[PDB]
Amino acid sequence: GSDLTYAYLVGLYEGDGYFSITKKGKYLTYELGIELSIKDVQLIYKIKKILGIGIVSFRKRNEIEMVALRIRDKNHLKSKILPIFEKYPMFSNKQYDYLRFRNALLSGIIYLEDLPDYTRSDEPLNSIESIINTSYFSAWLVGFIEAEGCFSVYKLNKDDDYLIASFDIAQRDGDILISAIRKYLSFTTKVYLDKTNCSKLKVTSVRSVENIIKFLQNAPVKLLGNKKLQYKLWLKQLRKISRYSEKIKIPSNY
DNA sequence: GCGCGCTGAGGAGGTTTCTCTGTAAAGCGCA
DNA sequence: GCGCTTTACAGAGAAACCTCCTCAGCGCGCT
Ligand SMILES: [Ca+2]
Ligand SMILES: [Ca+2]
């Protein structure tokens, strides 16, 4: 059906974007937005070119620059956004934000006084299996990696030249989801639950690095923005490292 | 030809969860 | 039985997330 770039998009908003109902006087603002580092300006404009709606804005705070796509137009939200987020639903508890967003929108809530206090539910709404078997998962995951994933290379010591390549990704209150990603990519290193309940999956072995590379070659869509640049950089360094390059067919035209 | 209620655009303020980088210790593989 | 590889674990701090306020101008009711 309707292209898997939309699924990518739901993965990306799930990671870096937000569903918001903010108050303005007696009235409400309905917003689907995404604010990124300036180095992702081209991505914001790709999103805008795909969705065909929303307003680009820039802003400087202290000395850092940011870009935002904001979709506040209720009719554009109803006709374009909900259908997307209905065809390819979000996988984590962020799904609860959307559910309440669409409900308040479609049933005409417009007065700050009609809009109940809300607290994101933490009632699990998925198992590893149900996520893993969803047909759009891999499209969604590329969007999610775009938003939340990190590709880095560093020294195992300081007084040495030995290098580590890692892929890593995290979510607060996202044990199931992060575990699902673990399973799907068949990583084996255990998930780190930190003191803030933030689940952290980090990976380094030749086999795991190979699996992520294979996954991104096989995925129905690519990284579009800055995460592409980083992945390409990572690959650049991967070729100069004995143990990875010699056991992996590193692609040259991702 | 003029209010009336309501709006998306525009401008920004607040806080932490992601990113990004490691380290101390432990596997593991083998003429 | 060392040397190349990986793992558990976790800290820093900004690139995110999520928020509210003001204003020019919309369709609309009554022309
Ligand atoms: Ca996020
Ligand atoms: Ca991001």
What can you see in these coordinates?
This protein is of the alpha+beta class and 254 residues long. It folds into two domains: 1-119, Homing endonucleases (Endonuclease I-creI), CATH 3.10.28.10; 120-254, Homing endonucleases (Endonuclease I-creI). The protein has helices at residues 5-16, 41-51, 74-87, 95-106, 128-132, 137-148, 175-184, 206-218, 226-239, 242-245, and strands at residues 17-24, 27-37, 55-61, 64-71, 150-155, 163-172, 192-193, 198-203. A hairpin with a 2-residue loop joins strand 1 (17-24) and strand 2 (27-37). The chain is globular and about 65 Å long. Bound molecules: calcium ion (2 copies). Residues 15, 148 line the site of one calcium ion. The protein binds a DNA duplex (31 and 31 nucleotides) through strand 1, strand 2, strand 3, strand 4 and strand 5. The PDB classes it as hydrolase/dna.
Order of helices and strands: HEEHEEHHHHEEHEEHHH
CATH superfamily caption of the largest domain: Homing endonucleases
Report the radius of gyration as a whole number of Å: 20 Å
What ligands does this structure carry? calcium ion
What gap, in angstroms, lies between the N and C termini?
A: 25 Å
Percent of residues in beta strands? 15-25%
Global shape: globular
Question: Strand arrangement, largest sheet?
Answer: 1-2-4-3
Number-wise, the strands total: 8
Structural class: alpha+beta
User: What percent of the residues sit in helical stretches (DSSP H or I)?
Assistant: 40-55%
Name of the CATH architecture of the largest domain: Roll
Number of domains: 2
The biggest beta sheet is recorded as: 4 strands, antiparallel
> Mind telling me the CATH class of the largest domain?
Alpha Beta
Determine the CATH topology of the largest domain. Answer: Endonuclease I-creI
By DSSP (H or I, 4+ residues per run), the number of helices equals: 10
Cofactor: Mg(2+)
GO molecular function, one term: endonuclease activity
Protein name: Intron-encoded DNA endonuclease I-AniI
GO biological process, one term: intron homing
